[PDB]
Amino acid sequence: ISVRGLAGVENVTELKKNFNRHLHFTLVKDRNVATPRDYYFALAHTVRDHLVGRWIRTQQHYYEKDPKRIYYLSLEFYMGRTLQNTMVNLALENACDEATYQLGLDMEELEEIEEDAGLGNGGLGRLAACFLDSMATLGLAAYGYGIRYEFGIFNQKICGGWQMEEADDWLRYGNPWEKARPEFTLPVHFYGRVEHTSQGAKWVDTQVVLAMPYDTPVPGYRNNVVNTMRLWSAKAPNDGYIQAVLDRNLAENISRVLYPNDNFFEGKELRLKQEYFVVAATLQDIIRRFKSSNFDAFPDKVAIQLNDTHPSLAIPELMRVLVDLERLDWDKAWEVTVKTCAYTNHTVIPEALERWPVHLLETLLPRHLQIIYEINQRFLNRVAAAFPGDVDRLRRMSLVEEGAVKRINMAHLCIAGSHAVNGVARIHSEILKKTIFKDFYELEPHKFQNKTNGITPRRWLVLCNPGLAEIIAERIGEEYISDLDQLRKLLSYVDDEAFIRDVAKVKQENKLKFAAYLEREYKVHINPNSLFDVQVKRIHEYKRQLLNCLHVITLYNRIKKEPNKFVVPRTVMIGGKAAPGYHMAKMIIKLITAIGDVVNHDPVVGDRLRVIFLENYRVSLAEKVIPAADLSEQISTAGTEASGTGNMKFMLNGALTIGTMDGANVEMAEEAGEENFFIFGMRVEDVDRLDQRGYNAQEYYDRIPELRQIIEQLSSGFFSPKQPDLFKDIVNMLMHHDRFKVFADYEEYVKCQERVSALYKNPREWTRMVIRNIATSGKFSSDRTIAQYAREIWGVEPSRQRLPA
Amino acid sequence: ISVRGLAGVENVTELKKNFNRHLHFTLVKDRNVATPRDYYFALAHTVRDHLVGRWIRTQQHYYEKDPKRIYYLSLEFYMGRTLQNTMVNLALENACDEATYQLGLDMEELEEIEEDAGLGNGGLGRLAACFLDSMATLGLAAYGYGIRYEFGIFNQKICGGWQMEEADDWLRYGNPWEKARPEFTLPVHFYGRVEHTSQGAKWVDTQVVLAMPYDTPVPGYRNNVVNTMRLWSAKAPNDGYIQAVLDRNLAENISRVLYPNDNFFEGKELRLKQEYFVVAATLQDIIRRFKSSNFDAFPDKVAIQLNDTHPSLAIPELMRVLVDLERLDWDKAWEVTVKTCAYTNHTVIPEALERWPVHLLETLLPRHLQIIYEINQRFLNRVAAAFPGDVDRLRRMSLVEEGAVKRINMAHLCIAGSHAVNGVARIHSEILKKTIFKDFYELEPHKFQNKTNGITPRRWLVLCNPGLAEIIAERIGEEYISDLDQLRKLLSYVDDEAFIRDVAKVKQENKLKFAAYLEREYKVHINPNSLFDVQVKRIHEYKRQLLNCLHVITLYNRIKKEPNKFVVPRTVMIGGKAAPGYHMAKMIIKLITAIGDVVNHDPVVGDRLRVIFLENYRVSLAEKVIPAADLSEQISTAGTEASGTGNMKFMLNGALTIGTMDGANVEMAEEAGEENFFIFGMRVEDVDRLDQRGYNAQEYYDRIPELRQIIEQLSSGFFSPKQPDLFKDIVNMLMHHDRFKVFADYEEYVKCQERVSALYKNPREWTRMVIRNIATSGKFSSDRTIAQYAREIWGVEPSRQRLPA
């Protein structure tokens, strides 16, 4: 069937009986009234049973050996589905496939019933998910800590070409993977005031909200390790009658919904509450566990990784506990804090940086504000001693920003209180040291590091592309699944006629599979022989879905100009959600559907060009589209995409990449060789040069006839007959206030696209270049990334040793 | 030793005795007083003896079979040396090498004594030479007809960094290859007047100049065919006494010297006389030979190819003879003329086009002017009938140009009187139909053809690069020498570790060989490990040696900026002659030497960068430098280099190419694959777009810091301390009247150059790309070119059959 494990006689028999047992006792159903959803749950509970034993002994193992614990704090964990992933990591896939087959059921059908755990917005949230997988696979005593949102990222509906949002009620039918632990509920304090008495300050008259944890198992790849992801849920304490009970839903709103902002900051009180909620509950858990195992050894037994500044309050909260509750002297407490905390930055765009108004912190967390002021005072004294007389440096590095309203720069807070600060791609980390954090780098160079992102090869290859994983294993074995660098061995098969044919065959199969799904759940048909040109990621101006749109319109205009001229057929697919309040992003989605409305119904175009907007892009959809892609669009303006991870997913799955020298694209091209990548556009240096001179879009419009035609088509209502000026905001933006210079890369982009079409016409050479990419994608495994965090930041050695059964 | 033929016992013995025989009887010398020059001549006469038998029987063969004869008229035949070429084509090289070795002589030393037959300026003249070789190799009854200049292209001396010209007295020691044929002397008429009497017009009261032919053998490659190149020499007829005899050197001045203008037109009377002289004498020879074999069959037995418009007078001269002397009716004569004549265009630059003032033709060739007017009248009547009312078309297509001084457009004359008109590269031929000759193409589309240039693989591979020819023959045999397409078979050795090593070894050997020669005859040393970056061709603004200079200065400035940074070492070599009256070209030569003066003596640069100007570039020097080159510079502004041929020479000899999509570069990249070529810059379409908008160099100067620095260095006297404003004319030109937009391609050029340096750092991959180029250079053999002329223009079939011993 495939290398999805063995389908043993004893195991298939056992799975079948436990399946029927759960269907009866757990679901309380009989085969006469059971529906597909019932079958999915019976299967889920059956697979879940297999990891409880390992989950219990893994945790017992950590208690006995007492290794250093790694705590990954994040407000997002974009997990997706967990049924297939669990079967994969437990080598249970073929057995379950056979067992369900014998029961007369199609396992693939049941898998589609599971709801995605969409507790994330995009890249940052997915990274945390891949990291959890790699830490377990590498045998690290790691814990993921976050919030159990009852509503994750909204489900996207497209109506009249516009994005409509609807609540993601993912818990409606229940979650078989989590285990509520009400017995470990902890109190979290808000508001109140600070009292300064004899020995120490006291935080009193606070409002209390309970934090109830739900644990979810995180299985390592075939090593019998099962780590834990603990998500906190808000509960009101039990201490007009009716109204008082109804108002409990004021405290519980803290864990109600995920804020849908990808790369953007909203200073809302509810978001601040969520951030402190996760931090306060998590730190009590960490300390409790530690006291079990003098806080001098705290950093030797504890490491906390801050995923962006969202959990930055961990720094002053740790100080508060050590100083106020444990009564350690400030200097001692600060030493411990810095040594246990590390911070990861994910973007350089100013609007994404968290800068909380002082009046908010003052009211919600009065003690933390005082602690932050003290940290700032002591930090600035160090700066002053290192750079005497440099008064502007003092104001630039302050954690407190003056102006209209005073704010606290959480990024500055994180750098000051962490022993390590890292970017997520080489070019990004360099940019941090040369620009945004230049002053900090000059003060403490040793703190700055790079940790290039990666993706887990389990979910992003074995799970979503079994056909490719199989033809690869046929040649080099299965060891690469947990040691991706072994993919390089495929380089010796680049001239192998058999391999070339198999690689091309799996891609065609994936495309047919996806082309079918498209008609199944969406209905509209597409041509499987065309080049699948896809750009899937959150909608943002910096990602430039608009540059993609300009190319699509260029292709359409060229066809209309010379209809009987041959052009490589293409299906361009664009998908991604827009933040609810991001007007421009919503206009871009409308533009895409509008283009499709014209292009997809033009008789002259035929099946040579199709424009489709992939609705509700999420983890489960990514697993379907990526394995089917031919061309991966990674065209952000140089210097804006910190790393990107979708780019790695495409590379590992046999798609060629067209992109700018931005984020990880640079290292990907470096690994595969620039001749095997379609690079175009301005480099970071070119962008800076243009800014020095002053970007004037008009220049491009005046010197490029094809570009002018497109703008006039948009302006005149060619793509919006009933509403002639529908896209006036888009044109105005491109022409007068385009922060990402779409026009500047237009010419080189279309030129580059012609080169990809030329290579696609030569199937054999296209595939050989593909093999060159897959063979060199090893560096982008999150196992490599985590091994570097472990050795260079956390001070722990990864292990590939199977746990005692 | 190598595949330079067999060194048979009988043959070596025979060669030795004939060598001593000539040294004694021919040179009248003894081994005690003989010098190296004497030995060269003894060897030359010995090899010459071997082709006389074949020369006599080849001509007898043509007389007996009476095939259609091909007459290639050219005012230039850039032959170079003929000793080694003769040995190669006769398979006598190893035998002569052994024979001279036994006599205690070094044949290579003797070969260097021979004077180049530099009867050409550059590309057009060398093409005629390669064509003669291919026509003989293909068994065509072909005759090259030209002028025996007693002084060829001037010898170039560099003094104080400036070009100095000195007479090329190539006949000083005699020419052993030619055979004077005073018995076949023919009369040529000049001046006079036209008398219209009873039956026909008569050209009377003319001045007579005798045309004395000298025949030179043209051996085919190992097929025993020996064709003839007949060059005419001017002689005064024998009919104050002293002064009258001394004035004979007025008529004989016609064949005294080659006009040194490459791509430029000077309306000098002496040049016009040379053009008619070659045409008049040649046509009498052709007709005489024909009458031996009703002029209705004339086109079936005769084909005359016009190399550019230089011999364009052949059209009205043929009409004059047929109408005035043979008394054929005009229409009949015109039919014959058009059917036997074909014209090849070599450039689209307006200043190169021949437009003779009517007053000159009126005085020198009164009858021809009348004939030209009549041709024009009848031609315009045809245009008027095809495009009624299009009066501007009439004036655009006229052979007579009105204005300040009336002139005759010789190109229009050629198109009207030829049944075929061809460009010399696909892009060039297309440009002719879309621009310069658009009106003519619309009137007679069937006349326009393309015949992409080529080079002879005998002189340009076997002769100049025996080491490479040998390692190639080792794998695929020697058949490729006369069937270059077989080189494709080398594609299956691109991964062969042995071949890769041998290809790289021959290149290193060629470079050491050249590096030595450089110190031997010029003294100044160079680093053999560096990348040999060479640009050799006549000096002209359109070829852009200046863009090369800008890159060199950029490299030097970058080194000075970061001295301890590593950069791939390079030796950039630039060579070529400038027309004596072309001021800008002479300033460019001075700039190059000036750059070297600074760069080559900068301690900080060391041996990382050297700039050398190759003095007296000519055919013999090309045979030395090309096999030693790593990088071939073919950077003309798109649309200006009709074809180029030096580019083909480099490709065949293992050098990678950096160039624009111009001339044959386009087809070369097409044959090898664009990934194996270093293409950069504007395409023809981009150039046109810039001209529409208006080229403003200032823009580039303002937006490119590195470019600005260079211009300021040139302007301030950085490269000319004693003469601060020495290069003011160059800067003024670049900044205000640059017809070839050097600045427009600067950025992309330097970027491309960085990519070549990157590949050079990886010896193995550099060599594999080289193999890819050599393997696909087959299309550029002049045998392919001539086979197309034969079948598509001359109506004759080429033959590879050995002539009966």
Ligand SMILES: CC(=O)NC(=O)N[C@@H]1O[C@H](CO)[C@@H](O)[C@H](O)[C@H]1O
């Ligand atoms: C706040 C923020 O930057 N959100 C976010 O999703 N950032 C994303 O994080 C990913 C993982 O590091 C990176 O690959 C992306 O480049 C970055 O935009």
Ligand SMILES: CC(=O)NC(=O)N[C@@H]1O[C@H](CO)[C@@H](O)[C@H](O)[C@H]1O
């Ligand atoms: C008059 C003239 O164009 N001279 C000349 O040398 N032209 C040259 O002829 C060569 C052979 O066709 C071409 O390869 C060159 O591109 C062209 O410049």
Ligand SMILES: *Cc1c(COP(=O)(O)O)cnc(C)c1O
């Ligand atoms: C991988 C992934 C992302 C990140 O994509 P980028 O192109 O790096 O922004 C976002 N959303 C989902 C569902 C993903 O799987």
Ligand SMILES: *Cc1c(COP(=O)(O)O)cnc(C)c1O
């Ligand atoms: C081949 C050759 C040329 C022509 O070179 P291009 O670069 O095509 O102009 C000119 N001069 C000599 C001596 C040549 O051998």
